[PDB]
Amino acid sequence: MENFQKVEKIGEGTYGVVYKARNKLTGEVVALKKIRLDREISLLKELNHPNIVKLLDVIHTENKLYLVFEFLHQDLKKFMDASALTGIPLPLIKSYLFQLLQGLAFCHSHRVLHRDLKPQNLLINTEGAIKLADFGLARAVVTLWYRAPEILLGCKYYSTAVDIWSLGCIFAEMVTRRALFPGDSEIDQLFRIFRTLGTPDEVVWPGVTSMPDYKPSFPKWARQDFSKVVPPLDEDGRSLLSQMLHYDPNKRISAKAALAHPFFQDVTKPVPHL
């Protein structure tokens, strides 16, 4: 790839390095990820949604694997950090949640899960958009904070519902300026979820006790009242958030259904100052 003049390293990680890069031909500026190694992906090139960072190209050359993405300058994590003094305005929080739910409705409608939503993976632009990025497509230190309980319990087959869970945790964090469930281990992550939402049993979650890593000796914590979870979210927002953090993947609200939730009756598209 002498076809790309590399502007700056956007990131590393076990699965590859990404650069902001200039196409010496196009003049176009892209993010370029080189996966170090040792067609299904290309179908996604034609699946484009305003709220998903676009996959432009997949290149298998000199026995290397490169993915090319649309480039955006800021992610939600940096934006929340610079907003920590003030917080993100609720109409902008509402707008970002609405847009993320649209992105997720789109990918889920095509049976594509994200599986690792986090503020670092959510890109925003000056025109008020927010886009899903980093779908871990390379799989045919990392935060557990947004991980759905079925994954933490070793479930081999998870559903679209894992993304709803992740986005709820992100919703809550946008509102409170605090990570909802800052576990420092898998079992610490689980037990932080339990201590707030109550230890799940078959009553609220049939088949929880059949998950691979479920132990009957999990401590039994009572559910806390949601009022402490996301103050000062109003009742519509708490209602919505409660349905996104449902223990049972089959009762957790879908992306499509959340879009019809009353919380969004007054949704607008504010513009951030970046």
Ligand X SMILES: COC(=O)[C@@H](Cc1ccc(O)cc1)NC(=O)c1cc(C(=O)O)c2cc(/C=C/c3ccc(Cl)cc3)ccc2n1
Amino acid (1-letter code) at residue 254: S
SS3 per residue for 12-68: CCCCCEEEEEEECCCCCEEEEEEECCCCHHHHHHHCCECCECCEEEEEEECCEEEEE
Residue with nearest beta carbon to ligand X: 137
In 3D space, the residue among 222, 224, 228, 263 whose CA is nearest the CA of residue 243 turns out to be: 263
Q: How far is the CB of 69 from ligand X (least distance, A)?
A: 4
Q: Are 118 and 145 in contact (CB under 8 A)?
A: yes
Instruction: Give whole-number Cα distances, 196 to 74, 116, 242, in Å.
Output: 32, 22, 12
Whether 116 is catalytic:
yes
Known binding-site residue numbers for ATP:
10-18, 33, 70-72, 75, 118-121, 134
Known binding-site residue numbers:
10-18, 33, 70-72, 75, 118-121, 134
Catalytic residue among 57, 81, 116, 225: 116
- Pick the closer one to ligand X by CB: 144 or 193: 144
Q: How far is the CB of 169 from ligand X (least distance, A)?
A: 18
Q: How far is the CB of 241 from ligand X (least distance, A)?
A: 25
- Pick the closer one to ligand X by CB: 18 or 153: 18
Q: Are 37 and 11 in contact (CB under 8 A)?
A: no
- Pick the closer one to ligand X by CB: 36 or 110: 110
Contact residues for ligand X, defined by CB under 6 A: 10-11, 18, 31, 33, 44, 47, 52-53, 55, 67, 69-72, 75, 107, 110, 112, 120-121, 123, 133-138
Write out the catalytic residue numbers: 116
